[PDB]
Amino acid sequence: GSSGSSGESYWRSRMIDAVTSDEDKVAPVYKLEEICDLLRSSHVSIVKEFSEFILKRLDNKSPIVKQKALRLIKYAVGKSGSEFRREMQRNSVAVRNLFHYKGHPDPLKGDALNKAVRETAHETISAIFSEENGSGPSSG
């Protein structure tokens, strides 16, 4: 029956990977819901790992893959729990870094696929930092 392996890294990655598949079709709502359940249904360690896999999608050279993550980032935050919110803010540079993501004019679609990424990034920061007011440590 049971047997070891190098680590439970596949379970976590599989979820994010499937909602960030290399397809232009918008990821189905039902798959997003499952992540939002697993997030609260798991310990905060899993929420940290989830965040890492999300970030690894911004690195994918494809424009589409980035956008898929951008919408998930905002769909997930605001429901999955507050832990994912704080951890996502810590690595939010990736989203801001896309406000000017021109990529390359895809010969097929005509610099369209890359808009989507950049567009969603603005909406995504508004979800990570979905805080009207806040606080922070003293400068001295």
mmCIF file of C-alpha atoms in Angstrom:
data_model
loop_
_atom_site.group_PDB
_atom_site.id
_atom_site.type_symbol
_atom_site.label_atom_id
_atom_site.label_comp_id
_atom_site.label_asym_id
_atom_site.label_seq_id
_atom_site.Cartn_x
_atom_site.Cartn_y
_atom_site.Cartn_z
ATOM 1 C CA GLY A 1 0.000 0.000 0.000
ATOM 2 C CA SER A 2 1.716 3.148 1.282
ATOM 3 C CA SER A 3 5.294 3.877 0.198
ATOM 4 C CA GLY A 4 7.460 7.014 0.396
ATOM 5 C CA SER A 5 8.570 9.375 -2.387
ATOM 6 C CA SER A 6 10.754 12.520 -2.506
ATOM 7 C CA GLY A 7 7.990 14.711 -0.951
ATOM 8 C CA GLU A 8 4.317 15.777 -1.171
ATOM 9 C CA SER A 9 5.350 18.550 -3.613
ATOM 10 C CA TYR A 10 3.214 17.065 -6.437
ATOM 11 C CA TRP A 11 -0.137 17.453 -4.573
ATOM 12 C CA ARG A 12 0.366 21.169 -3.960
ATOM 13 C CA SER A 13 1.830 21.980 -7.401
ATOM 14 C CA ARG A 14 -0.858 19.944 -9.303
ATOM 15 C CA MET A 15 -3.615 22.218 -8.002
ATOM 16 C CA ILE A 16 -1.968 25.504 -9.087
ATOM 17 C CA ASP A 17 -0.596 23.951 -12.307
ATOM 18 C CA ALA A 18 -4.052 22.816 -13.536
ATOM 19 C CA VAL A 19 -5.626 26.293 -12.984
ATOM 20 C CA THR A 20 -2.572 27.713 -14.869
ATOM 21 C CA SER A 21 -2.514 25.150 -17.743
ATOM 22 C CA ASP A 22 -1.032 26.178 -21.118
ATOM 23 C CA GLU A 23 -4.432 26.882 -22.747
ATOM 24 C CA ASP A 24 -6.014 30.296 -23.618
ATOM 25 C CA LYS A 25 -9.441 29.116 -22.265
ATOM 26 C CA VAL A 26 -10.223 30.852 -18.953
ATOM 27 C CA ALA A 27 -9.700 28.407 -16.049
ATOM 28 C CA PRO A 28 -13.056 26.904 -14.853
ATOM 29 C CA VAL A 29 -14.588 28.235 -11.602
ATOM 30 C CA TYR A 30 -15.020 24.672 -10.182
ATOM 31 C CA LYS A 31 -11.214 24.126 -10.138
ATOM 32 C CA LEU A 32 -10.629 27.463 -8.326
ATOM 33 C CA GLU A 33 -13.153 26.510 -5.620
ATOM 34 C CA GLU A 34 -11.204 23.337 -4.811
ATOM 35 C CA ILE A 35 -8.042 25.394 -4.060
ATOM 36 C CA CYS A 36 -10.058 27.775 -1.808
ATOM 37 C CA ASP A 37 -11.356 24.723 0.120
ATOM 38 C CA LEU A 38 -7.954 22.971 0.382
ATOM 39 C CA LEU A 39 -6.364 26.266 1.585
ATOM 40 C CA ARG A 40 -8.640 26.583 4.676
ATOM 41 C CA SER A 41 -8.831 22.753 5.046
ATOM 42 C CA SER A 42 -4.996 22.650 5.416
ATOM 43 C CA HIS A 43 -2.470 23.923 7.956
ATOM 44 C CA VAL A 44 -0.733 27.307 7.432
ATOM 45 C CA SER A 45 2.431 25.422 6.207
ATOM 46 C CA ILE A 46 0.441 24.309 3.133
ATOM 47 C CA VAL A 47 -0.745 27.927 2.583
ATOM 48 C CA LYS A 48 2.955 28.991 2.522
ATOM 49 C CA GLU A 49 3.823 26.250 -0.025
ATOM 50 C CA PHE A 50 0.757 27.186 -2.182
ATOM 51 C CA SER A 51 2.074 30.779 -2.349
ATOM 52 C CA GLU A 52 5.487 29.504 -3.617
ATOM 53 C CA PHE A 53 3.900 27.494 -6.467
ATOM 54 C CA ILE A 54 1.732 30.514 -7.430
ATOM 55 C CA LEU A 55 4.914 32.639 -7.767
ATOM 56 C CA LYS A 56 6.642 29.946 -9.885
ATOM 57 C CA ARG A 57 3.917 30.564 -12.564
ATOM 58 C CA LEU A 58 4.952 34.249 -13.088
ATOM 59 C CA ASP A 59 8.349 32.853 -14.286
ATOM 60 C CA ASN A 60 6.680 30.810 -17.083
ATOM 61 C CA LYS A 61 7.732 32.572 -20.329
ATOM 62 C CA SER A 62 4.168 32.302 -21.738
ATOM 63 C CA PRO A 63 1.907 35.398 -21.344
ATOM 64 C CA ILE A 64 -1.247 33.283 -20.732
ATOM 65 C CA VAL A 65 0.272 31.281 -17.812
ATOM 66 C CA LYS A 66 0.943 34.568 -15.964
ATOM 67 C CA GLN A 67 -2.677 35.857 -16.390
ATOM 68 C CA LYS A 68 -4.076 32.505 -15.188
ATOM 69 C CA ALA A 69 -2.115 33.039 -11.942
ATOM 70 C CA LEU A 70 -3.169 36.764 -11.727
ATOM 71 C CA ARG A 71 -6.908 35.903 -11.665
ATOM 72 C CA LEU A 72 -6.321 32.979 -9.217
ATOM 73 C CA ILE A 73 -4.303 35.267 -6.881
ATOM 74 C CA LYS A 74 -7.329 37.601 -6.643
ATOM 75 C CA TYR A 75 -10.040 34.891 -6.734
ATOM 76 C CA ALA A 76 -8.310 33.001 -3.901
ATOM 77 C CA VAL A 77 -7.563 36.012 -1.667
ATOM 78 C CA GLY A 78 -10.687 37.471 0.022
ATOM 79 C CA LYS A 79 -12.151 33.949 0.721
ATOM 80 C CA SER A 80 -9.388 31.299 1.209
ATOM 81 C CA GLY A 81 -8.360 32.874 4.524
ATOM 82 C CA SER A 82 -6.249 35.725 5.939
ATOM 83 C CA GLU A 83 -2.997 33.638 6.015
ATOM 84 C CA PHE A 84 -2.850 33.531 2.191
ATOM 85 C CA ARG A 85 -3.450 37.322 2.177
ATOM 86 C CA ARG A 86 -0.386 38.199 4.340
ATOM 87 C CA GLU A 87 1.927 35.727 2.569
ATOM 88 C CA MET A 88 0.760 36.937 -0.863
ATOM 89 C CA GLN A 89 1.576 40.604 0.100
ATOM 90 C CA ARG A 90 5.194 39.552 0.977
ATOM 91 C CA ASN A 91 5.740 38.321 -2.627
ATOM 92 C CA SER A 92 3.479 40.842 -4.369
ATOM 93 C CA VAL A 93 6.452 42.374 -6.306
ATOM 94 C CA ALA A 94 5.698 39.850 -9.068
ATOM 95 C CA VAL A 95 2.270 41.387 -9.725
ATOM 96 C CA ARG A 96 3.563 45.042 -9.705
ATOM 97 C CA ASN A 97 6.365 43.991 -12.055
ATOM 98 C CA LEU A 98 3.639 43.285 -14.683
ATOM 99 C CA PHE A 99 2.069 46.784 -14.844
ATOM 100 C CA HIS A 100 4.488 47.296 -17.806
ATOM 101 C CA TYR A 101 4.666 43.630 -19.010
ATOM 102 C CA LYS A 102 4.643 44.209 -22.791
ATOM 103 C CA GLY A 103 6.210 40.752 -23.462
ATOM 104 C CA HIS A 104 6.418 40.326 -27.277
ATOM 105 C CA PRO A 105 3.691 40.929 -29.913
ATOM 106 C CA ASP A 106 2.441 37.337 -30.398
ATOM 107 C CA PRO A 107 2.335 36.924 -34.248
ATOM 108 C CA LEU A 108 -1.002 35.114 -33.916
ATOM 109 C CA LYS A 109 -3.109 37.251 -31.563
ATOM 110 C CA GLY A 110 -1.242 40.589 -32.049
ATOM 111 C CA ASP A 111 0.112 41.740 -28.640
ATOM 112 C CA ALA A 112 -3.243 40.735 -27.055
ATOM 113 C CA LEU A 113 -2.365 37.749 -24.792
ATOM 114 C CA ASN A 114 0.134 39.953 -22.906
ATOM 115 C CA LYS A 115 -2.458 42.757 -22.198
ATOM 116 C CA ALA A 116 -4.570 40.363 -20.179
ATOM 117 C CA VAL A 117 -1.659 39.677 -17.756
ATOM 118 C CA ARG A 118 -0.914 43.376 -17.211
ATOM 119 C CA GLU A 119 -4.640 44.235 -16.956
ATOM 120 C CA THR A 120 -5.359 41.628 -14.281
ATOM 121 C CA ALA A 121 -2.180 42.631 -12.325
ATOM 122 C CA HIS A 122 -3.765 46.005 -11.386
ATOM 123 C CA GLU A 123 -6.975 44.279 -10.174
ATOM 124 C CA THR A 124 -4.819 41.660 -8.382
ATOM 125 C CA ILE A 125 -2.887 44.274 -6.298
ATOM 126 C CA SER A 126 -6.285 45.764 -5.334
ATOM 127 C CA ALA A 127 -7.197 42.231 -3.988
ATOM 128 C CA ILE A 128 -3.894 41.498 -2.155
ATOM 129 C CA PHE A 129 -4.049 44.974 -0.571
ATOM 130 C CA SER A 130 -7.869 44.868 -0.231
ATOM 131 C CA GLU A 131 -7.348 47.008 2.917
ATOM 132 C CA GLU A 132 -9.010 50.385 3.320
ATOM 133 C CA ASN A 133 -6.602 51.282 6.177
ATOM 134 C CA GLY A 134 -3.628 49.503 7.841
ATOM 135 C CA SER A 135 -0.616 49.801 10.188
ATOM 136 C CA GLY A 136 3.199 49.244 10.193
ATOM 137 C CA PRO A 137 6.243 49.339 12.566
ATOM 138 C CA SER A 138 7.931 52.573 13.679
ATOM 139 C CA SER A 139 10.713 53.936 11.413
ATOM 140 C CA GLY A 140 12.919 54.280 14.572
#
